[PDB]
Amino acid sequence: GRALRVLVDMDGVLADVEGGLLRKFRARFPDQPFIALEDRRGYKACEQYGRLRPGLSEKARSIAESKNFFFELEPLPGAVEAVKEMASLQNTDVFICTSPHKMFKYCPYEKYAWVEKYFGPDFLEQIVLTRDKTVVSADLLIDDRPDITGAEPTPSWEHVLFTACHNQHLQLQPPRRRLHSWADDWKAILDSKRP
Amino acid sequence: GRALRVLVDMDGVLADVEGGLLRKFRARFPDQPFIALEDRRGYKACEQYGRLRPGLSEKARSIAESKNFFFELEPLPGAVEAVKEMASLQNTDVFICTSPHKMFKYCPYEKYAWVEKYFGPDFLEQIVLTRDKTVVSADLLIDDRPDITGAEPTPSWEHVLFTACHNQHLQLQPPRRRLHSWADDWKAILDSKRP
Numbered sequence: 001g002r003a004l005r006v007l008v009d010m011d012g013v014l015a016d017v018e019g020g021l022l023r024k025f026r027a028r029f030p031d032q033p034f035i036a037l038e039d040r041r042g043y044k045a046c047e048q049y050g051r052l053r054p055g056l057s058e059k060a061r062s063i064a065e066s067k068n069f070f071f072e073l074e075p076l077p078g079a080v081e082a083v084k085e086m087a088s089l090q091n092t093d094v095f096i097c098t099s100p101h102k103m104f105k106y107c108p109y110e111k112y113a114w115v116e117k118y119f120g121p122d123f124l125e126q127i128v129l130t131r132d133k134t135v136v137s138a139d140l141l142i143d144d145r146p147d148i149t150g151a152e153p154t155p156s157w158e159h160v161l162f163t164a165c166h167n168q169h170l171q172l173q174p175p176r177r178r179l180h181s182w183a184d185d186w187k188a189i190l191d192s193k194r195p
Numbered sequence: 196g197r198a199l200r201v202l203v204d205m206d207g208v209l210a211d212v213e214g215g216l217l218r219k220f221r222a223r224f225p226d227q228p229f230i231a232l233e234d235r236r237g238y239k240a241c242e243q244y245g246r247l248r249p250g251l252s253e254k255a256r257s258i259a260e261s262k263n264f265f266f267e268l269e270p271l272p273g274a275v276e277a278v279k280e281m282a283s284l285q286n287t288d289v290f291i292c293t294s295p296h297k298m299f300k301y302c303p304y305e306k307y308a309w310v311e312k313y314f315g316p317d318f319l320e321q322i323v324l325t326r327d328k329t330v331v332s333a334d335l336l337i338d339d340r341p342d343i344t345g346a347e348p349t350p351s352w353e354h355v356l357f358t359a360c361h362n363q364h365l366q367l368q369p370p371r372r373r374l375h376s377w378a379d380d381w382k383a384i385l386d387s388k389r390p
């Protein structure tokens with residue numbers, strides 16, 4: 001007491017939503033152009049697909065809306081190991097703070113199931129499902145979305161940007177910070193917020 | 196700006212979880228003793244069922260864990276009308292802040308579906324699913340659970356206790372407040388927190 005509280009985003013931070021989208025898009029729509037991971041720009045993949053060719057945004061969306069899309073995402077390298085270690089640290093509380101998106105039949109269930117699979121049943125109590133992360137209080141939010149907005153104009157967390165291909169070239173306004181991958185020094189970031 | 200932010204609990208505040216539990220329990224287990232609504236005491240119904248007769252807690256739990264339990268709950272009188280009005284007020288942001296419980300196959304989906312049904316698709320973005328309400332920041336939390344605890348020792352909200360049969364006889368520690376039903380003067384409660 002007090003415990004440092006860290007919110008960890010799920011999509012693109014713990015679960016490889018980009019790789020999953022691209023793989024399943026390519027398999028389901030093999031004759032359509034696609035966006036190679038390195039060429040991704042901007043948080044919303046479907047929007048970029050729409051610019052590639054008309055109709056592709058809805059097809060990209062249909063991949064993400066399909067049963068087992070979220071459940072079958074691969075963990076990002078080091079993600080499960082890092083979050084387990086982080087949660088186990090003294091004076092450190094970790095919550096997985098993630099959006100259900102505009103899709104509720106499968107996505108919430110599958111996100112819970114995915115967390116159960118990789119972190120165990122006891123970690124389910126650490127999940128906060130919300131479209132608005134600004135109303136969740138914490139010391140840190142690790143999330144791959146550059147612009148996080150919502151009902152709270154002054155969120156209590158510092159947003160640390162987790163690198164993803166869609167944001168990796170972005171110049172952030174100082175003093176905004178990055179976590180480059182789970183191999184990067186996340187302990188140093190947490191420690192900088194401690195008493 | 197700033198908008199007053201109000202968290203409204205779902206079970207026992209918007210949706211009649213007590214009536215639904217009792218009705219479906221009685222229908223599925225007609226030869227078992229039950230707990231009449233007026234005799235409910237303590238937030239956790241299944242725990243009281245367990246004291247009534249051994250094995251009854253697991254049966255009560257099975258009712259709540261069954262498909263369509265949450266979806267088929269009836270709204271409490273005045274609840275949908277009040278929350279719609281509250282959300283429509285100037286400088287007032289409403290979030291439905293509710294637990295998925297220890298059950299994730301049906302409960303999250305059904306809670307989203309229930310909100311869609313009674314409040315419309317656009318209200319889905321106001322849902323926060325969490326087992327820990329203390330990490331959700333707001334001015335007010337209207338919730339029928341007397342004791343709300345979690346990772347944040349000093350939540351930012353004032354907890355206003357929504358009357359339910361299990362809490363109606365409880366003497367609260369001053370200056371804790373109650374909302375007796377949605378017929379009660381909820382506007383006065385909100386107004387007391389405004390600048």
Ligand SMILES: [Mg+2]
Pocket residue numbers: 009010011012013143144145
């Ligand atoms: Mg993300």
Ligand SMILES: [Mg+2]
Pocket residue numbers: 204205206207208338339340
């Ligand atoms: Mg409740």
Ligand code: NA
Pocket residue numbers: 065066103104105106107
């Ligand atoms: Na879905």
Ligand code: NA
Pocket residue numbers: 260261298299300301302
């Ligand atoms: Na369930």
